Each structure stands twice: as C-alpha cells, then as structure tokens.
C-alpha cells in the first residue's frame, strides 16, 4: 500500500506540513471535488487493493509503529509494532474482511473488542480530548506507548490516550486545514496544549458537515450547523463558503448533482 | 470625465470585449468586492466630479454621439450629439443638480419629460425588448437615429428604440458577463436577434439580485430568486455561487458586514 514516513525527531512546521500534504495526496484521487473541497473515495465499489494507506511514524527514541489509515474516511484502523498488529473492532463484515489484507506478514495479529471512535477511547483513557495534550512531545510519547503495548509496557489507558493523540494529529489534521494549523502552532513554539472548543466541535461535526455540504442547494445549507469559536461562543454556518479554508477533505455522502 | 471610445465600424468580438472591459474598469474603484463581485460606488457621499463617465460612439457613417453613464448604476443618463444635449427626466433633486455638470459646453440642453427605465421606453417605442433586435447593425443604426434626433430626422419611437439598444448593449453588458457574451455571439456571426428570456429576466432583476447577494447569510439567500433559461424554463437561485460567472457589477445596497 502507499506508506508515508514522518519522524517526530526534529520535526519543524515544514516537515509536519509536508507530511500532512502527502497524506491528503494519497487519500484523494483528484476525481471528485465539490465547492473546491475534495471528496474522499466512496466505499461501495472501491477495490481492497486501494482501500488503505500506511503511515510510518518514528520518534527520537528510534522506535517505529505503522498505522493503517482507511482511505474512505482517513481514520486509523489498526497498527503494527514489530511482531504484532492490533486492529480496532470492525463494525461490519465488509471491514472485518478488508483488514485481513493489512500487515499479512506479521506473526501475531489481534483485534481489540472496542472500536476506534472518540467516546470509547475517552472512557478507556479515563480522560476527555479537552484534557489531553497535543503537540510534537505528546506524539513522541504516543509512538513509544503504542510500541511498548506489545510487551506489557503500556497499560490500556495510556494506549487509548496515545490513540486519541495520533488520530487528532494525523486523521483530523488531514480532514481540516484548520486543525493542521492548530498543530503547526504547537510545533512552531514547541508548545503542547489540550484542544480548545473550536477543534473538538470541528472533529465532532466532520461527518455532518460533509453531508450538509454535499446536500446543499448550490452551497446554501437547508439547516445551519452551529460550531464554536476558541472561547466557546457558538456560531452558525449557513453556507459552504466559509468552510472552504477550514475543511480539507469530506467523506463521500452522495453523488454530485447534475 | 473619463471618456471611452468605441466604433461599430469594423467591430469584432475583441474590440467590443475591450470596450466593455474599459467601461467596467471606469465604473469600479476596486475598493469594494463581495463574494468576488465588484460593487459600484455608493451614491451618498460620492463627489460630482467622480459621478459620470462618458462613452463616445461612432459608426460606419462617421457620425458620433457621447452618452453619459451614471457610475453608481452604469445607466445612461443623457447624451450629446453635436450642438445639443438631451437628458432623461431626473427623478430627484440631487440628480437634477448633478446632470448640470455634464456637457456644459453645449449650446442647446434639453431634458425629456420621460425617465430612461425600460417600461416607459417600450411604451414610447411602441415595442417590447423581446421584439427589438440587438447586434452590431442595430447599434450602428441607433447611433444615427440618436444623432439625427437633433434635426427632426428621428421620430420619438425610433429615439426610444435606439435608447433600448444602447442601454442593453452598453449598460447591461457591463452589468453582466452573461449579456456581454450574448452580444459577442451576435458580433461573431454578425447576427442580430431580439433578446431571449434569460437576458430580459437578468436585466429585470439586476437590482433585486444586488440586494439579495449583499443581504445574504454568507452567500445563502433568505428567499430564492427565480430567473429563466433561454427556452423560458424558470429556475431558482439559492446562492451567490452560481451568479458569480453571470453578474459582473452590483449596485450598492448596504455596507459589507464585519
Ligand atoms: N477509527 C476511528 N478512529 C478515530 N476516530 C474515529 C474512528 N471512527 C470514528 N471516529 C470518530 O469518533 C466519533 C464517533 O465515531 P462514530 O461512532 O463512527 O460516529 C466521530 O467524531 C468519528 O469521526
Ligand atoms: N436611466 C436608465 N436607463 C436604462 N435603464 C434604466 C434606467 N433606469 C432604470 N433602468 C432600468 O429600467 C427598469 C425600471 O427602472 P426603475 O424605474 O428605476 O426601477 C429596471 O430594469 C432598471 O434597471
């Protein structure tokens, strides 16, 4: 499958930016763009051979892990750390069968009982996104936790917390130029801070925003979506135009109108 | 005032296109653009010295006339043909006073009792836009009619009909890239044909389209505007996005939101 490499060791805003441009470039075919926003491939009819891309992450401690991203939604589906592969609970037969094509060469393959969505992951992590730190240092740490899961070195709460950081720093930054900007600021000043309300509200409404845009009357939404600003003030979106510098990829919801 | 020259003698699609790009360039300051469409200057606070531009038209018969265009709406306000100037009925004191600054050097100045809007002009012309021919040949003819008005050569129905052709080939083509395209086709094939429904419906709703766009919720219209296709099928516009390749200039209706 395509593999993209990124190391947290000595990451700068440009090597991180290059990494996220490369992931978006693998996720998209260029075939489907609606109101200037690329739509991800539709899962019905996609061949297994084009279903996943892999992301190989390395850290300052010279440890690596490879995450498998699903190309229809850019979400992390499972991962490899040396001799073992772990996959989240497939929530349908089609996906149960698809993940058998990943990391076939690994000896021990495990499937967790829990899925990879945020709520399960926050329950298991014993903590919410609002309290978990994101930045180059948290991702550095996450690479190690994930890698030492193999050998009893990581307990399930640190595993879940490391999954939340990976998914927001890779999958969500690819879904949104806005969240990628948020991560670049953290790297520029080498800060680590929990996500503010605008980040979490964007992440929660990615699927609904994709549908509202694709079902729109020429860009006009039938019902408005309320998002939040950094300080928590709510605001309504009525049109795709203001989301164009904010969302970078949409999940396929319907075919483009005539 | 700025003056732009155009001759119907040997007009091609590029000399006509150059002429309409020059008129739009004089009408607009570049200061106010909303959803990629330029807004014309607001009449409250505009100095008289920047209120009009002049368009000097010549034809194959080596006759000229100069029309005065109002810069707040690109409409024809009056005209000069040699020793005489004629102005439409000013419909307010502010405009009565403004037109005194035009063609001051002419000996005979007249103000018609009728205004220049389409209905009055169709009544006087004894004919509707749907039946009047537009093209390089009708504009050629209009230049002569307008010029011979001075000397009893043109009767008021031909005067009104010549005003309808000038206003659609200059003011409306500047208001709309669409109507300018319509006129370029006529010149390319040297055809003359009356305007179809999409043209007349655009002309009739220029003012309402300007307000709907400037009062929009981020591009989304509160109420849709029904326009017509060439064959007369009605269709609704819900968003400014589809009007962007169609309208080139908007009349000022309100100040741009924060
Ligand atoms: N495999 C996954 N990895 C990370 N986040 C996910 C995954 N699947 C879903 N999500 C996100 O978690 C939340 C709930 O997911 P879901 O239960 O499929 O709607 C939504 O914000 C999803 O975008
Ligand atoms: N001076 C003018 N010359 C040509 N058309 C005009 C002029 N003033 C208004 N119109 C158009 O004629 C119609 C009626 O004008 P009004 O009576 O001002 O709304 C509308 O389509 C206007 O855009």
From Swiss-Prot, chains A, B:
Catalysed reaction equations from the record: Endohydrolysis of the N-glycosidic bond at one specific adenosine on the 28S rRNA
UniProt: a carbohydrate binding residues: 3-5, 10, 45, 136-141, 190-192
Annotated residues for binding of AMP: 75-76, 116-118
Active-site residues annotated for this sequence: 75, 118, 172, 175
Biotechnological and industrial applications of this entry: A deglycosylated form may be linked to monoclonal antibodies to produce immunotoxins exploited in cancer treatment. However, a point mutation should be introduced to eliminate vascular leak syndrome, a side effect resulting from endothelial damage.
Source organism, top-level taxon: Eukaryota
Effect of substituting residue 92 to A: No effect on the toxic activity but Suppresses the vascular leak syndrome
Function (record text): Acts as a glycosidase that removes a specific adenine residue from an exposed loop of the 28S rRNA (A4324 in mammals), leading to rRNA breakage. As this loop is involved in elongation factor binding, modified ribosomes are catalytically inactive and unable to support protein synthesis. Can inactivate a few thousand ribosomes per minute, faster than the cell can make new ones. Therefore a single molecule can kill an animal cell.
Name of protein: Ricin A chain
Origin organism lineage: Eukaryota, Viridiplantae, Streptophyta, Embryophyta, Tracheophyta
Full protein stretch here: 41 to 298 of 576
């Amino acid at each position: 499958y395509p593999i993209i490499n990124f190391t947290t060791a000595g990451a700068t805003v440009q090597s991180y930016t290059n990494f996220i441009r490369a992931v978006r470039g693998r996720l998209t075919t260029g075939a489907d763009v609606r109101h200037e926003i690329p739509v991800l491939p539709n899962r019905v009819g996609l061949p297994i051979n084009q279903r996943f891309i892999l992301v190989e992450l390395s850290n300052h401690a010279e440890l690596s892990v490879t995450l498998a991203l699903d190309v229809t939604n850019a979400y992390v589906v499972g991962y490899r750390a040396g001799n073992s592969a772990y996959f989240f609970h497939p929530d349908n037969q089609e996906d149960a069968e698809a993940i058998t094509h990943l990391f076939t060469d690994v000896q021990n393959r495990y499937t967790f009982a829990f899925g990879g969505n945020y709520d399960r992951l926050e329950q298991l992590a014993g903590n919410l996104r609002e309290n978990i730190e994101l930045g180059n240092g948290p991702l550095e740490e996450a690479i190690s936790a994930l890698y030492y899961y193999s050998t009893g070195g990581t307990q399930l709460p640190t595993l879940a917390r490391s999954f939340i950081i990976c998914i927001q720093m890779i999958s969500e930054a690819a879904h949104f130029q806005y969240i990628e900007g948020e991560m670049r600021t953290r790297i520029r000043y080498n800060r680590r801070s929990a996500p503010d309300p605008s980040v979490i509200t964007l992440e929660n409404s990615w699927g609904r925003l994709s549908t509202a845009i694709q079902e729109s009357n020429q860009g006009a939404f039938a019902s408005p979506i309320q998002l939040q600003r950094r300080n928590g003030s709510k605001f309504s979106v009525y049109d795709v135009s203001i989301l164009i510098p904010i969302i970078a990829l949409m999940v396929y919801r319907c075919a483009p109108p005539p």
